[PDB]
mmCIF file of C-alpha atoms and ligand atoms in Angstrom:
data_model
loop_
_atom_site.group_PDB
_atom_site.id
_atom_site.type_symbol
_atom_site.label_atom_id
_atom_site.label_comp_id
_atom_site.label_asym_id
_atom_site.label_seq_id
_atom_site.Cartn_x
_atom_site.Cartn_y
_atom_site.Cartn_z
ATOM 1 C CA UNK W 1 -30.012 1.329 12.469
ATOM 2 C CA UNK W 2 -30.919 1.666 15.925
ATOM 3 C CA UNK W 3 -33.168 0.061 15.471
ATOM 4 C CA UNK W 4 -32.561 -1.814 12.137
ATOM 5 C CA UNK W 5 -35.199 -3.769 10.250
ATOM 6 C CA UNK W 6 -34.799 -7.541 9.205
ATOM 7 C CA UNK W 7 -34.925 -6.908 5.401
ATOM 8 C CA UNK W 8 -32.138 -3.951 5.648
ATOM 9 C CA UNK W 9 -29.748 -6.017 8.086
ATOM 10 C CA UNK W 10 -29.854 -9.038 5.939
ATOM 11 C CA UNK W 11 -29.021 -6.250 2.705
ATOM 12 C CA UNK W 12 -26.107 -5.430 4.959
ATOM 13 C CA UNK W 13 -24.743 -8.867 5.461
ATOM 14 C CA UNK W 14 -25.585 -10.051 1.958
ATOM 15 C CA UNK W 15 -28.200 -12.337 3.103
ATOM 16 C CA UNK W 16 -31.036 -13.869 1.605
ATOM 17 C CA UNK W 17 -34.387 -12.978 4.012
ATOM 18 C CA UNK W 18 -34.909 -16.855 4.649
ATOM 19 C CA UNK W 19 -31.554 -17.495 5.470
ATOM 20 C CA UNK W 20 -31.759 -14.419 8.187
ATOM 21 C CA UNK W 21 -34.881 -15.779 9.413
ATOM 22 C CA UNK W 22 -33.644 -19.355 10.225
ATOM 23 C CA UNK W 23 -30.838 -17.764 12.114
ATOM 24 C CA UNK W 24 -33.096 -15.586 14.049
ATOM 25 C CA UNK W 25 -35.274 -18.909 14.731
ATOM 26 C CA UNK W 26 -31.373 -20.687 15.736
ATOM 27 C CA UNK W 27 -30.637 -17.896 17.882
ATOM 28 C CA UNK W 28 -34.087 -17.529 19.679
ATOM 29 C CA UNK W 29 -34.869 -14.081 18.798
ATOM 30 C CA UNK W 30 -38.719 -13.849 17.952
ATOM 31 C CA UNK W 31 -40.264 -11.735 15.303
ATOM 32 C CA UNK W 32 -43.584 -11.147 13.335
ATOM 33 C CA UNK W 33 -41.858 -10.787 9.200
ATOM 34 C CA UNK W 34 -38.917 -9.244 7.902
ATOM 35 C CA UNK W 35 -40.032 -6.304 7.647
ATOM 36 C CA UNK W 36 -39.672 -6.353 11.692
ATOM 37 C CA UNK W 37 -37.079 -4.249 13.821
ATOM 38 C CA UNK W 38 -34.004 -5.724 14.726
ATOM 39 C CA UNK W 39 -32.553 -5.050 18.694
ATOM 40 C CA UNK W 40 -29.502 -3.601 18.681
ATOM 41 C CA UNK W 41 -28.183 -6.312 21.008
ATOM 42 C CA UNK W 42 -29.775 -9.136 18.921
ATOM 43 C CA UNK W 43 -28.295 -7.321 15.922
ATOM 44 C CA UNK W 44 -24.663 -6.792 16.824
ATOM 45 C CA UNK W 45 -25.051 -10.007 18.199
ATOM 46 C CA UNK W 46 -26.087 -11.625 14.400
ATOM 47 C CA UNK W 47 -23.356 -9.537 12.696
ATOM 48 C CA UNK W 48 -20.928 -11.617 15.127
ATOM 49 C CA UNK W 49 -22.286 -14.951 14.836
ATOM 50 C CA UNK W 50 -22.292 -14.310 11.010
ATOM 51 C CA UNK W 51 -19.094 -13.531 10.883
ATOM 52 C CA UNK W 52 -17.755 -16.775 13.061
ATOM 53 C CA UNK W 53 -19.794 -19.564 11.015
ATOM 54 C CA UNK W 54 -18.622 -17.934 7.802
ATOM 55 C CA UNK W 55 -14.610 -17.425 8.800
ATOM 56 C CA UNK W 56 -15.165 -20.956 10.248
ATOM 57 C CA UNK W 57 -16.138 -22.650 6.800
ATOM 58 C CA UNK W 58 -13.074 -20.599 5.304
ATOM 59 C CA UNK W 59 -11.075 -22.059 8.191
ATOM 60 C CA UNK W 60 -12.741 -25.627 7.256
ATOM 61 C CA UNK W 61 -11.982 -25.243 3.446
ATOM 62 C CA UNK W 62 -8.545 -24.189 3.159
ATOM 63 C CA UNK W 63 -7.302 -26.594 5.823
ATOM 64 C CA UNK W 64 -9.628 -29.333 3.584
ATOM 65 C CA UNK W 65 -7.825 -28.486 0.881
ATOM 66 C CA UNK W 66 -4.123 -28.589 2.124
ATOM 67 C CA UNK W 67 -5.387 -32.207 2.883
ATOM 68 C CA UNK W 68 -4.430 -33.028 -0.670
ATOM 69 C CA UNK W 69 -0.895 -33.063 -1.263
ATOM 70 C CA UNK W 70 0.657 -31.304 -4.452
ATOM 71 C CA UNK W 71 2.109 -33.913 -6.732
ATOM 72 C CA UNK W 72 5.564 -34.373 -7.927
ATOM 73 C CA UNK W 73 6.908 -36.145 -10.791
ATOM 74 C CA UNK W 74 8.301 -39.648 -11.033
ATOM 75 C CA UNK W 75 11.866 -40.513 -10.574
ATOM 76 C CA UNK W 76 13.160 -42.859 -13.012
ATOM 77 C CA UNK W 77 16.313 -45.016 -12.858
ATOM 78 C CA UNK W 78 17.476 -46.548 -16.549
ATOM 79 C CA UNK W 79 19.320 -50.185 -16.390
ATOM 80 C CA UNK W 80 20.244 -52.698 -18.272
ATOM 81 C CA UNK W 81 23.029 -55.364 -19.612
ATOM 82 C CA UNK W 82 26.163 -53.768 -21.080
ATOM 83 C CA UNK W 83 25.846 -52.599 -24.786
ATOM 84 C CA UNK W 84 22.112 -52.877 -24.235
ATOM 85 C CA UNK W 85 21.754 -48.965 -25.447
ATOM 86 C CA UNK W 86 21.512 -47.377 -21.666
ATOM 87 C CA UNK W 87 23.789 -44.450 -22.343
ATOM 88 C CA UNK W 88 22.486 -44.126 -25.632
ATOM 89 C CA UNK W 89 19.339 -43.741 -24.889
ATOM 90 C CA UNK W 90 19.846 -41.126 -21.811
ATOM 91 C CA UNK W 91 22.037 -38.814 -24.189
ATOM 92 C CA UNK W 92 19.060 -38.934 -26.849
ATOM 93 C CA UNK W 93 16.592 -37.935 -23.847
ATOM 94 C CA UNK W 94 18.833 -35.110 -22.905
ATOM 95 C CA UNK W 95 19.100 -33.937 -26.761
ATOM 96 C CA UNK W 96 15.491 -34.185 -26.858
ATOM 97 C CA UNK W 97 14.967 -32.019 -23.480
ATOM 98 C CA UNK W 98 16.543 -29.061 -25.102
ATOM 99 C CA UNK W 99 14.832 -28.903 -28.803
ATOM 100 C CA UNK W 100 16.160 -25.417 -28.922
ATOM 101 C CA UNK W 101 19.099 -23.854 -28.726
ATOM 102 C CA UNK W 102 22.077 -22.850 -26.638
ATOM 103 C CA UNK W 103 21.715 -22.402 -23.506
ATOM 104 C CA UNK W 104 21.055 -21.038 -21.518
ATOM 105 C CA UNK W 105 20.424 -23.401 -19.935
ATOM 106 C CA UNK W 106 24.330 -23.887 -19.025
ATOM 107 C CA UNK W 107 22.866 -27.511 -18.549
ATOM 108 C CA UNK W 108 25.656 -28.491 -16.074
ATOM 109 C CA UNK W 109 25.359 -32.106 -14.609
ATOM 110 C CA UNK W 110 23.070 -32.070 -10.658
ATOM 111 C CA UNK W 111 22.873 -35.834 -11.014
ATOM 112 C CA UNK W 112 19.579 -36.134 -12.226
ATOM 113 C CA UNK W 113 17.366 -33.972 -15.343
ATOM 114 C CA UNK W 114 14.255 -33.690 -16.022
ATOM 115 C CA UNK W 115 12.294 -33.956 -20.045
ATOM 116 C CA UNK W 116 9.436 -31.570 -19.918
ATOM 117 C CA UNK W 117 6.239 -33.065 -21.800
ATOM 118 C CA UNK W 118 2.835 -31.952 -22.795
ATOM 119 C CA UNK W 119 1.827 -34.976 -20.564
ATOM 120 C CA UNK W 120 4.015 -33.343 -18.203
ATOM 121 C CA UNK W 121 7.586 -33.605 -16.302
ATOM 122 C CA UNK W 122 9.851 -36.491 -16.160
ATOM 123 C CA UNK W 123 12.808 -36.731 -13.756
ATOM 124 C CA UNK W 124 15.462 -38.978 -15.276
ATOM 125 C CA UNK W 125 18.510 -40.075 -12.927
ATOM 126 C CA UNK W 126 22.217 -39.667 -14.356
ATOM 127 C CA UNK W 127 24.964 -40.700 -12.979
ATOM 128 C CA UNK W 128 26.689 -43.904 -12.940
ATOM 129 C CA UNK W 129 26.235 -46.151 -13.399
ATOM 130 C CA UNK W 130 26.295 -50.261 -13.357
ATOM 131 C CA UNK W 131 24.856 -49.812 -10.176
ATOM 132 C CA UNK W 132 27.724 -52.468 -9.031
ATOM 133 C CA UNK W 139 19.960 -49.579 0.529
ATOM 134 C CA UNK W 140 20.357 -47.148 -0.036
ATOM 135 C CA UNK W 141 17.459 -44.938 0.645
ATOM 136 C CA UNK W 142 14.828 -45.395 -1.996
ATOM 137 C CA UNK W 143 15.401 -42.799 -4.735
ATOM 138 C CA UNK W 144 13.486 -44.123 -8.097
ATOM 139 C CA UNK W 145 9.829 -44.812 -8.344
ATOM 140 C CA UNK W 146 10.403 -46.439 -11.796
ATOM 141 C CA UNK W 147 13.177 -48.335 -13.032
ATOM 142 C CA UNK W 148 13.549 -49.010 -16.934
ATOM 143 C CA UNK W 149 14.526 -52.381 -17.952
ATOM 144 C CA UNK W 150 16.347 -51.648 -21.036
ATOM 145 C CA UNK W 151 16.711 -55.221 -23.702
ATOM 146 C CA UNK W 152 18.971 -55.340 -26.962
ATOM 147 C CA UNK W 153 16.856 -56.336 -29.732
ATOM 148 C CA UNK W 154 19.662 -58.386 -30.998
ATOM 149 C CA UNK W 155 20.768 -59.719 -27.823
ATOM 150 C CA UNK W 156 18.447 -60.629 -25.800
ATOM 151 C CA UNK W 157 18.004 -60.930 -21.943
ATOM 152 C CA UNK W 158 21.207 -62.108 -20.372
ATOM 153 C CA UNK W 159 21.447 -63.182 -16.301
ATOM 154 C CA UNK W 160 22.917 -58.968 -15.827
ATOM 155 C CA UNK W 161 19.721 -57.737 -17.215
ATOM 156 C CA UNK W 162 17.884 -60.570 -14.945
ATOM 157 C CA UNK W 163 19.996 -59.571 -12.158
ATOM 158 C CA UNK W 164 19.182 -55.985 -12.611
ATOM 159 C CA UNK W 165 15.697 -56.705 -12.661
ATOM 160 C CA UNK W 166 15.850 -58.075 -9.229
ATOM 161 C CA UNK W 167 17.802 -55.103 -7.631
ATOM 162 C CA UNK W 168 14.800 -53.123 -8.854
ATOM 163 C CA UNK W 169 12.375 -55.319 -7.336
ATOM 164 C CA UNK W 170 14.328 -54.997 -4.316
ATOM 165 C CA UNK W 171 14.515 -51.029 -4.977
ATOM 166 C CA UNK W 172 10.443 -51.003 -4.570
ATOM 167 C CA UNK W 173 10.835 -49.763 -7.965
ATOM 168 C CA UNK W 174 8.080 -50.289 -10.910
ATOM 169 C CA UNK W 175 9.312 -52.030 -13.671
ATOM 170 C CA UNK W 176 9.274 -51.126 -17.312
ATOM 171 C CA UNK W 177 10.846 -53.130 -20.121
ATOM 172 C CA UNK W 178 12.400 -51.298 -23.000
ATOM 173 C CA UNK W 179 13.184 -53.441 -26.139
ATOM 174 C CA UNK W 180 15.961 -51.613 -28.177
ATOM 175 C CA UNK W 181 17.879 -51.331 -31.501
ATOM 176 C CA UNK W 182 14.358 -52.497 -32.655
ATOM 177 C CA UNK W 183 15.891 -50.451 -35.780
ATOM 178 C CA UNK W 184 18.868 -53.704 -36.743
ATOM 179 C CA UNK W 185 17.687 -56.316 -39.387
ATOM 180 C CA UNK W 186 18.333 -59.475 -36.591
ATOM 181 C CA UNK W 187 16.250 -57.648 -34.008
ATOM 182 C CA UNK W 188 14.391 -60.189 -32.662
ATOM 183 C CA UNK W 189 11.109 -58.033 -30.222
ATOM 184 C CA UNK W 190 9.004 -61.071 -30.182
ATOM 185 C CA UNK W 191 11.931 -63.284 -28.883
ATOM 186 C CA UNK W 192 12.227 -60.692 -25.666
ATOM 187 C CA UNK W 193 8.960 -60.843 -24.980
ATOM 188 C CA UNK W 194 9.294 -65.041 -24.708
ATOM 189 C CA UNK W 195 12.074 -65.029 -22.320
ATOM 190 C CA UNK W 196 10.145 -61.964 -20.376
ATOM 191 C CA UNK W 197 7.638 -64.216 -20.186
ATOM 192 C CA UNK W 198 9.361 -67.776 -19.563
ATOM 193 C CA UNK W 199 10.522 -65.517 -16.656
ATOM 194 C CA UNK W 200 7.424 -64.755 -15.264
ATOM 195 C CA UNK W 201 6.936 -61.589 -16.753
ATOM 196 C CA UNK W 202 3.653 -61.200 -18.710
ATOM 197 C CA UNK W 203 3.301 -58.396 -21.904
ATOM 198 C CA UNK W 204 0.027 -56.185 -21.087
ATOM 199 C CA UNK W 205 -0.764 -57.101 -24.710
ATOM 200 C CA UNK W 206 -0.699 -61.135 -23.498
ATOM 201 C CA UNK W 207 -3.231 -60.176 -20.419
ATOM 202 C CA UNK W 208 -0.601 -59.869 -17.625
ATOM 203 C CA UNK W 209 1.188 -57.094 -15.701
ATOM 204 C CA UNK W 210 4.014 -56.410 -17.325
ATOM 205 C CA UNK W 211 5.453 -53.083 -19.487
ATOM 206 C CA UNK W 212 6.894 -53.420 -22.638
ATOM 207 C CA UNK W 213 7.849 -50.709 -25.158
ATOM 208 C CA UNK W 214 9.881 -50.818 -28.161
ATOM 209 C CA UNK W 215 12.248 -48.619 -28.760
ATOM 210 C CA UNK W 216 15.087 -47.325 -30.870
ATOM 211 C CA UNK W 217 17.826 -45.306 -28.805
ATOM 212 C CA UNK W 218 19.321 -44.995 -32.177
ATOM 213 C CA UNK W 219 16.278 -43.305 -34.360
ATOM 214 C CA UNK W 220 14.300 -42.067 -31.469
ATOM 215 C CA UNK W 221 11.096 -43.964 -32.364
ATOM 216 C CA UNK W 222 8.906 -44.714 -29.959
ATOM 217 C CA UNK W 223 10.898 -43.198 -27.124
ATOM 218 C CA UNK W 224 8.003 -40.589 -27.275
ATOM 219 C CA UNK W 225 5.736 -43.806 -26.136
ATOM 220 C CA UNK W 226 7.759 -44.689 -23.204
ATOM 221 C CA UNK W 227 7.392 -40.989 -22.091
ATOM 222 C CA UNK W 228 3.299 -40.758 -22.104
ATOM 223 C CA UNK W 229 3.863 -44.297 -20.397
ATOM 224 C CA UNK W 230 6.031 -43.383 -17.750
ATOM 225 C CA UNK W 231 3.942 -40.811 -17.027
ATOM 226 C CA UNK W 232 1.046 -42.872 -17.634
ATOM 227 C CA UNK W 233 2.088 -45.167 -14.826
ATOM 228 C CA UNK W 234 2.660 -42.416 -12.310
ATOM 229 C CA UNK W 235 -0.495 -41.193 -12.541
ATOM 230 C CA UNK W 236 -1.672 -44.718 -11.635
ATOM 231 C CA UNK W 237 0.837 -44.807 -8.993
ATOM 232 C CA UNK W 238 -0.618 -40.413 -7.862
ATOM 233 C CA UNK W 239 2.971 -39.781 -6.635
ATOM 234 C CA UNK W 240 2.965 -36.660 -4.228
ATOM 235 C CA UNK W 241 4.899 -34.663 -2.038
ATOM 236 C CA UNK W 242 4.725 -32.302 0.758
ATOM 237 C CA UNK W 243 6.323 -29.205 0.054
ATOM 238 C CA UNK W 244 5.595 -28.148 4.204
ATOM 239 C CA UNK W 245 7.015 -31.366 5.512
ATOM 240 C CA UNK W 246 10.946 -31.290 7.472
ATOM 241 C CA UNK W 247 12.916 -31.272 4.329
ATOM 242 C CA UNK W 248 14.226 -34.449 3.479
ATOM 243 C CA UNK W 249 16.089 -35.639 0.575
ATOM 244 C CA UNK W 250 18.779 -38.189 -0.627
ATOM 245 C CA UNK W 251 22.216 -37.752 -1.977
ATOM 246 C CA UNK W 252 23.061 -38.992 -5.698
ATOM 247 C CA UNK W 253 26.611 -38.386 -6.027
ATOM 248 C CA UNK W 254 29.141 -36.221 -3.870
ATOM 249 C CA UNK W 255 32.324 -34.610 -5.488
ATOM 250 C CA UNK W 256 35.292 -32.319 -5.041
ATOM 251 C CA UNK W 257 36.152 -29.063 -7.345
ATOM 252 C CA UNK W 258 39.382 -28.455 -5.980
ATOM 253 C CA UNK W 259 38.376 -24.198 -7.188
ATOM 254 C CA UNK W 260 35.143 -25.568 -5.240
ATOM 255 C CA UNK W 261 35.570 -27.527 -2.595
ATOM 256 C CA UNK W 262 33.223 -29.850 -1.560
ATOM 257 C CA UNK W 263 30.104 -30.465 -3.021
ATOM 258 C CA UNK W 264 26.899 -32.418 -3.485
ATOM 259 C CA UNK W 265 24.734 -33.083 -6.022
ATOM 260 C CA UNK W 266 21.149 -34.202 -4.005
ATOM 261 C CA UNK W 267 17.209 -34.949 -4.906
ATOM 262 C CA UNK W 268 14.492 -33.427 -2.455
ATOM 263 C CA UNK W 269 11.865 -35.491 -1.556
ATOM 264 C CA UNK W 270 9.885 -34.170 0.984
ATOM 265 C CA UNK W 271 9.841 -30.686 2.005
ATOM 266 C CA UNK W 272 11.370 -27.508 0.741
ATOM 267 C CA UNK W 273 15.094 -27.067 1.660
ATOM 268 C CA UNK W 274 16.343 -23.554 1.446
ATOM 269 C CA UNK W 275 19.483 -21.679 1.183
ATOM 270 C CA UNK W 276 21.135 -21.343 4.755
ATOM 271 C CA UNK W 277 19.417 -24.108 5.753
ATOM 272 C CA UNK W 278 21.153 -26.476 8.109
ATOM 273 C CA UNK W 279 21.473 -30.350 7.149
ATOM 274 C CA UNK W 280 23.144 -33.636 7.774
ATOM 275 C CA UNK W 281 23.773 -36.531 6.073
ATOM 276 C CA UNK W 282 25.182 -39.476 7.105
ATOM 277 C CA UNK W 283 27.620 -37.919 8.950
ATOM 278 C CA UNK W 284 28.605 -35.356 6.748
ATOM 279 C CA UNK W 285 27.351 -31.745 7.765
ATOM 280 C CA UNK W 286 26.900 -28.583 6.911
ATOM 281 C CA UNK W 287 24.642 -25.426 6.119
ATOM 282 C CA UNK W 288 23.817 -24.735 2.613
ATOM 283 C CA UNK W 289 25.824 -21.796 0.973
ATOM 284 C CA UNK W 290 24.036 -22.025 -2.703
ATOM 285 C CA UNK W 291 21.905 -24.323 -5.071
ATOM 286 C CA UNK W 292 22.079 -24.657 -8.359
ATOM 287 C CA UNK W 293 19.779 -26.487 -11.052
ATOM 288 C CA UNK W 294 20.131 -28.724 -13.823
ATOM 289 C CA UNK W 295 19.330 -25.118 -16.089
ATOM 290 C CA UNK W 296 21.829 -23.592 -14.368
ATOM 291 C CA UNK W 297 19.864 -21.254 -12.082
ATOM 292 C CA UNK W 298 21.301 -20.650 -8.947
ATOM 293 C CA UNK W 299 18.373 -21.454 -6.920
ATOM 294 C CA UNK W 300 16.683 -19.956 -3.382
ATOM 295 C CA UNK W 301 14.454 -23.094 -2.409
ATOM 296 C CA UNK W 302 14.481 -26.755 -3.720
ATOM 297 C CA UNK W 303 11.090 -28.251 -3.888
ATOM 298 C CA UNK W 304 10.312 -32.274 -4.340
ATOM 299 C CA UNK W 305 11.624 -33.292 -7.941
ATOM 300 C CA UNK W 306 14.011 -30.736 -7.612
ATOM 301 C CA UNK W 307 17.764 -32.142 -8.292
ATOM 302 C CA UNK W 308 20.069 -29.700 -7.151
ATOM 303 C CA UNK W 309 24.388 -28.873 -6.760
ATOM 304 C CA UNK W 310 24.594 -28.319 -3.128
ATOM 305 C CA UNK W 311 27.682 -25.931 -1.350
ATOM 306 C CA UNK W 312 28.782 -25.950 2.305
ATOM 307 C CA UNK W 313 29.140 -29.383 2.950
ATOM 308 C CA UNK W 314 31.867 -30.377 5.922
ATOM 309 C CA UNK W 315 32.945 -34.090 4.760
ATOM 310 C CA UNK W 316 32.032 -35.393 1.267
ATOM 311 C CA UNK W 317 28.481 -37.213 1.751
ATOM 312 C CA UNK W 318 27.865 -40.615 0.990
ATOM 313 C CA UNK W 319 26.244 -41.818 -1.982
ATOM 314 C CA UNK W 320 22.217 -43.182 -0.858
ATOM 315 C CA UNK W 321 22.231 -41.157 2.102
ATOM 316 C CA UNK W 322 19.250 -39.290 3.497
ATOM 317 C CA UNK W 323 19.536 -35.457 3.628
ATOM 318 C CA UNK W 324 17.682 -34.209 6.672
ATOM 319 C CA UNK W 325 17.152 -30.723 7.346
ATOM 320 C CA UNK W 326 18.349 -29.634 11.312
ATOM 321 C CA UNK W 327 17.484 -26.587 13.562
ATOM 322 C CA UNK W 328 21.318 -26.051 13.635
ATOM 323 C CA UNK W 329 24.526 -25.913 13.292
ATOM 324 C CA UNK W 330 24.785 -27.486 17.026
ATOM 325 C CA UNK W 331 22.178 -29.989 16.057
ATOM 326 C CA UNK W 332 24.216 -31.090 12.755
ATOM 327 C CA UNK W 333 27.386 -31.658 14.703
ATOM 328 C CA UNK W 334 25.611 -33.536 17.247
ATOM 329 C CA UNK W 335 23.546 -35.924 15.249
ATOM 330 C CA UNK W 336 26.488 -36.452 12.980
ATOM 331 C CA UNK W 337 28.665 -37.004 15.976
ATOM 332 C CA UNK W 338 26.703 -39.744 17.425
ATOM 333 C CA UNK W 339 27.030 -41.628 13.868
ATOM 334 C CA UNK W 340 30.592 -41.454 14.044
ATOM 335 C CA UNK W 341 30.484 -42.560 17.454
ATOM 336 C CA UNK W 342 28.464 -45.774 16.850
ATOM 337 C CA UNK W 343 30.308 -46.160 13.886
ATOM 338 C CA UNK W 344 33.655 -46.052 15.067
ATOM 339 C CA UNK W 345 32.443 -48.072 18.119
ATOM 340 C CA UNK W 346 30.847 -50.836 16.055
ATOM 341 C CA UNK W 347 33.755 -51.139 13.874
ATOM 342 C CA UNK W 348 35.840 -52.087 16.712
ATOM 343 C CA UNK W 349 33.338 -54.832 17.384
ATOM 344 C CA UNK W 350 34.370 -55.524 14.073
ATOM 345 C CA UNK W 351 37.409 -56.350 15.881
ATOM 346 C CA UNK W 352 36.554 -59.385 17.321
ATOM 347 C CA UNK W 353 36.043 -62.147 15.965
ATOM 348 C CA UNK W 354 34.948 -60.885 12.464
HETATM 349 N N1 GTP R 401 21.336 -50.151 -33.695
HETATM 350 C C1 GTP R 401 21.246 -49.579 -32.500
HETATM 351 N N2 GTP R 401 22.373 -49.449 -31.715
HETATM 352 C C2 GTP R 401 22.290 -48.867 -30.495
HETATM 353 C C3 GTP R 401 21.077 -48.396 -30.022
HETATM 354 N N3 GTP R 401 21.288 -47.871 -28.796
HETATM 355 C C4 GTP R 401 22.598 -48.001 -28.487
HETATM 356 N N4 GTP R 401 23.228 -48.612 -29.533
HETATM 357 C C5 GTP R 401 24.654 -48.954 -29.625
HETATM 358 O O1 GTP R 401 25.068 -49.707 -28.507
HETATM 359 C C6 GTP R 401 26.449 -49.497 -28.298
HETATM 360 C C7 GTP R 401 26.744 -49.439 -26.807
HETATM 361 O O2 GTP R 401 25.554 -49.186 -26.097
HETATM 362 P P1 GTP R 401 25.372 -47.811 -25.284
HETATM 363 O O3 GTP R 401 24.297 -46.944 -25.881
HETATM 364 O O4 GTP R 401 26.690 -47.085 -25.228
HETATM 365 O O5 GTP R 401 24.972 -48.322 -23.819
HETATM 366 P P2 GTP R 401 26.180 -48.727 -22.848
HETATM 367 O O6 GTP R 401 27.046 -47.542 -22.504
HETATM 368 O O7 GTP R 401 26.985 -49.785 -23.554
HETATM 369 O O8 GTP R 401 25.482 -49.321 -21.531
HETATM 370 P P3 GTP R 401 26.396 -50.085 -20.452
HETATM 371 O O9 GTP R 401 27.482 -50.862 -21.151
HETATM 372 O O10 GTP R 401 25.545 -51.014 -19.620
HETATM 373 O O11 GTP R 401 27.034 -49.043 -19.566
HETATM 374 C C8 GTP R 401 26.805 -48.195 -28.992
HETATM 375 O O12 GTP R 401 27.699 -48.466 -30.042
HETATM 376 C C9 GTP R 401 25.510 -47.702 -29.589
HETATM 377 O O13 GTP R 401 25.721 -47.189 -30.880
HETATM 378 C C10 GTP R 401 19.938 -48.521 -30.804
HETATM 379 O O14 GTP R 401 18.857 -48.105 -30.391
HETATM 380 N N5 GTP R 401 20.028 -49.116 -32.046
HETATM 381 MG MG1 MG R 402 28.803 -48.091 -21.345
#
């Protein structure tokens, strides 16, 4: 140091001699070899721009990398005709998430749960129901077909609600497990409607299963899952939090409350929101497992406290600034709504 040779400044920056040399040359700093002396202007002055092109390609990496978005797993609506084996089928897939024990795991109801796989997670919507806009809230719908029964206008009707739901279809053929099961017979009036077996060369998803015996139900799991990863659903956990709301409630030792899935974002505890018109901040979260929870992440289905007005079913959760931000963006809904409804006056 003062003055520093070539070979013992590129030591210090952990620099192979070539690498030094080229910079030098970049610069436009002459020298004879390495083993020349270094100015201490010229030095100080390569110790700086070292340090900027390498925090620079640090800089360029990790905002290359938040480029790709975390994944999140795939939201999956069950339908069906009546009798078909839909509530069967989601109690078995419950029973199977907990293989265990009690609890602990208090495994109260958020409106959706989720089966954990090797493959990896599953988040299965329950609720009600039938079904009898709104916001989109499954990426795969499951088409589920008696055996024994066969596909009736309902099921064809639920079908098309899916379709209309941008969801991705998957037939399940049930109570494979009865004597006057008829699989093959499904798969005819599947495909007499358009909709073509994989196994036939077309599009179309089609898993047996028995609700009853549980066979095969690991199948429509790897599938599901299968699928998504065709699909590479993703989330941003940094985005505005926004979410959608199953199924709102009252616990008269509660009050109001909300059982919601996140979607994008990360809403936290404290956190101001609105939906619909309902408002509110959030007072607590709590899981399907119980846990009363800081942060909800995308997946995440989650009991929500602190709500003003019971929220409708469908409607988007958006995360506010405020509490004067809530009121007013809920206000103006009310407004238009009220409004509009009195142009539902006349002649309507
Ligand atoms: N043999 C057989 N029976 C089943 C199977 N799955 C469901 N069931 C029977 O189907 C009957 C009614 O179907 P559920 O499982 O309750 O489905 P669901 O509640 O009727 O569905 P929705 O009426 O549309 O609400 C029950 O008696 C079940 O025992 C199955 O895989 N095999
Ligand atoms: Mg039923």
């Amino acid at each position: 140091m003062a003055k520093v040779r070539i070979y013992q400044l590129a030591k210090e920056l952990g620099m192979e001699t070539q690498e030094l040399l080229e910079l030098l040359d970049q610069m436009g700093v002459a020298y004879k070899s390495h083993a020349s002396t270094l100015e201490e202007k010229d030095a100080e002055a390569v110790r700086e721009l070292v340090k900027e092109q390498r925090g620079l390609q640090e800089k360029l990496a990790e905002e290359e990398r938040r480029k790709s978005l975390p994944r999140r797993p795939p939201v999956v609506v069950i339908m069906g005709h009546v009798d078909h084996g839909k509530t069967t089928l989601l109690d078995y897939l419950r029973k199977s998430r907990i293989a265990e024990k009690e609890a602990g795991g208090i495994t109260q109801h958020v409106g959706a749960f989720e089966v954990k796989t090797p493959q990896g997670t599953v988040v299965f919507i329950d609720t009600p129901g039938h079904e009898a806009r709104g916001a989109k809230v499954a990426d795969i719908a499951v088409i589920v077909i008696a055996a024994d029964d066969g596909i009736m206008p309902q099921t064809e009707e639920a079908i098309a609600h899916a379709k209309a739901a941008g969801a991705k279809l998957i037939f399940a053929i049930n109570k494979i497990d009865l004597p006057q099961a008829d699989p093959e017979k499904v798969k005819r009036q599947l495909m007499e409607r358009g909709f073509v077996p994989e196994e036939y060369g077309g599009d179309a998803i089609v898993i047996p299963i028995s609700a009853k015996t549980g066979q095969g139900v690991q199948d429509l799991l790897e599938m599901i899952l299968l699928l998504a990863e065709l699909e590479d659903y993703r989330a941003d956990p940094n985005a505005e939090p926004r979410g959608v709301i199953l199924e709102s409630k009252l616990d008269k030792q509660a009050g109001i409350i909300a059982n919601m899935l996140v979607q994008e974002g990360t809403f936290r505890v404290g956190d101001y929101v609105v939906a619909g018109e309902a408002y509110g901040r959030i007072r607590a979260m709590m899981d399907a497992d119980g846990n009363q929870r800081k942060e909800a992440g995308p997946g995440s289905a989650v009991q929500v406290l602190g709500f003003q007005e019971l929220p409708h079913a469908g409607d988007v959760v958006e995360w506010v600034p405020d509490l004067e931000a809530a009121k007013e963006i809920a206000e103006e809904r009310k407004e238009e709504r009220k409004a509009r409804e009195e142009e539902e006056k006349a002649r309507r």
